[PDB]
Amino acid sequence: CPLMVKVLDAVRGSPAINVAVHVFRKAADDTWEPFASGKTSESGELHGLTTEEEFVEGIYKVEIDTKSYWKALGISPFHEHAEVVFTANDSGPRRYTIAALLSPYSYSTTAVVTNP
Amino acid sequence: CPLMVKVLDAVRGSPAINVAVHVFRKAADDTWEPFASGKTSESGELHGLTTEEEFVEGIYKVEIDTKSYWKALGISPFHEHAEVVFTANDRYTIAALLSPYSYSTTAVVT
Amino acid sequence: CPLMVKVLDAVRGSPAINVAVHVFRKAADDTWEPFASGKTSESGELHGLTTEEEFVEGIYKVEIDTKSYWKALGISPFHEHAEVVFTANDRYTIAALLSPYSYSTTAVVT
Amino acid sequence: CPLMVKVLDAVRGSPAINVAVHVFRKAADDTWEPFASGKTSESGELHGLTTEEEFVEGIYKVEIDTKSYWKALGISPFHEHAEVVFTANDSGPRRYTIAALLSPYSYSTTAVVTNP
Ligand SMILES: Cc1nnc(-c2ccnc3ccccc23)[nH]1
Ligand SMILES: Cc1nnc(-c2ccnc3ccccc23)[nH]1
Ligand SMILES: [Ca+2]
Ligand SMILES: [Ca+2]
């Protein structure tokens, strides 16, 4: 799994479950093209987005649907989403974990990049 | 003063100075219209972006050029930028704390 | 103004108002001597804690009473408090962003 | 494992490896007593601190030695440590993950609490 996403909820102290995640890749023409999508599991983790073959060099955007997450819990959140945009695999293939921690008016994100 | 951006550096323990910030408003065709821009000051703050009459309800995007910031300090960064997207509903401070492989953002709405 | 504390609320998107803050300095016997205290203001800030002559080099602890803060809002919190411990070496802002099960802290030293 | 600690490095985008962690429990007399200690692994994780039998109700303090971590990397950090202090198991046994994200002048911490 060269790309994994993990989401936590800072209000409840829990994994953020059933969070939709959409991944895009910048095309030659500078537009965002769909790349992969999925939803977090009961552990707040999303595996299986992509493969070593499909996850080529490029500029990727990981868009985490924070707004729907909070709205489902009955809460009115501030942000439309949380996005992470980065260049991947420039110096050869790497594994990337994008982690996010969510509150209604705030989020943080970190990347863990490892060399297979 | 309806909209202010404040940027902090978690590596140096300082304001993030001379950070480029561009603000956009979402247009009816779902594209992003330029709205405001500037560079953070010596205090890491960017004031004077808009006025009450100009800042209508809508979806706004604050694009912070974190990559140029880190490169100007000689530090290797992960992100292309940090973009913060929110709805304004009828004073907003967008605050960001930057590290090379992470960022945090909060809204202070008073 | 050598020492300021600023507290923000990530749930409400606001300053964290009326938060109790106690500052201590580490004594030669490794116990903690009271140094300063106060409650954050309407802006989430606590100024006027010390003076330049009083704030000598040493190890300082800033204890923020996050549990009382959350309970006064009717919200169930994880932590007993948030304590931030650092060395002052010859202006410091200790900033904290609070959530019920998490907190973040940074130092702005100028 | 009722108590786990995970540490990440926000500068390098990596697990924070070889971080010392000391856990204390408040005694009857209101002092901190040693409870357990260990160091993070190559994954930035510390397992095996305690057991279901030993991890009784109480007020616990998890002290993460951030200062030594940065100093070993040749960096002068701001904080002496990062601590997390919480009441555990008050409404019955729970599993607790304390996660921390480190930068030289900043840290964040979150708790993930689950019901076995
Ligand atoms: C998953 C996961 N493992 N550690 C974290 C984490 C902890 C503290 N602060 C954060 C801020 C941003 C993203 C993750 C984190 N998340
Ligand atoms: C002052 C001041 N205005 N914003 C912070 C802030 C913003 C985002 N994330 C955080 C994480 C930790 C501490 C402060 C912050 N500090
Ligand atoms: Ca290349
Ligand atoms: Ca009990």
Residues contacting residue A5 through CB under 8 Å, at least 6 positions apart: A21, A38, A40, A45, A46, A49, A62, A64, A97, A98, A99, A100
CATH number, domain with residue B22: 2.60.40.180
How far apart (Å, rounded) are the C-alpha atoms in residues B52 and B54?
6
Provide the Cα torsion D38, D40, D45, D46; round to 10°. Answer: -10
Tokens 């910030």, residue?
B21
Residues contacting residue A116 through CB under 8 Å, at least 6 positions apart: A2, A93, A94, A95
Q: Which residues of D fall within a CB distance of 8 Å from C80?
A: 59, 85-87
Q: Which two tokens mark B76?
A: 């290797």
- Are D67 and C86 in contact by the 8 Å Cβ rule? The answer is no
Q: How many CB pairs under 8 A join B and D?
A: 37
- Residue D108 labeled ligand binder: yes
Kindly state the DSSP code that residue D27 receives in the 8-state scheme.
-
Atom of ligand 2 nearest to the CA of C93: 1
How far apart (Å, rounded) are the C-alpha atoms in residues C94 and C8?
11
How far apart (Å, rounded) are the C-alpha atoms in residues A54 and A41?
22
Tell me, rounded to whole angstroms, the distance of Cα B56 from its chain centroid: 18
Residue type at position C5: V
Point out residues after which chain B has a gap (C–N over 2.5 Å): 90
> Is the CB of D110 inside a 6 Å radius of any atom of ligand 1?
yes
> Is the CB of D101 inside a 6 Å radius of any atom of ligand 1?
yes
Question: Within a 10 A sphere around the Cβ of A30, how many other Cβ atoms?
Answer: 7
Resolution in A: 1.3
Q: Domain range spanning residue C25?
A: 1-110
Binding residue ranges of B for L-thyroxine: 6, 45, 104
- Residue C45 labeled ligand binder: yes
Q: Which residues of C fall within a CB distance of 8 Å from A101?
A: 102
Which mutation among D6, D8, D64 tests ligand 1's pocket best, with the greatest number of atoms within 8 A of CB? D8
Count the residues in chain D: 116
Handedness of CA D62, D93, D27, D59 (dihedral sign): positive
How far apart (Å, rounded) are the C-alpha atoms in residues D38 and D8?
16
Residues contacting residue D112 through CB under 8 Å, at least 6 positions apart: A8, A13, A14, A15, C101, D96, D97, D99
CB contact under 8 A, C86 and D80: yes
Q: How far is A41 from chain B (nearest CA, A)?
A: 23
To 5 degrees, how large is the angle CA B13–CA B19–CA B21? 130
Q: Which two tokens mark B47?
A: 């004031």
Q: Does residue C66 sit in helix, strand or coil? A: helix
- Residue C6 labeled ligand binder: yes
Q: How many domains does chain C have?
A: 1
Closest residue by Cα to atom 2, ligand 1, is A99
> Is the CB of B106 inside a 6 Å radius of any atom of ligand 2?
yes
Handedness of CA A16, C64, D46, B79 (dihedral sign): positive
How far apart (Å, rounded) are the C-alpha atoms in residues A82 and A68?
11
Residue C97, judged by CB atoms within 10 A of its CB (0-12, 13-18, 19+), counts as buried
Atom of ligand 2 nearest to the CA of C6: 1
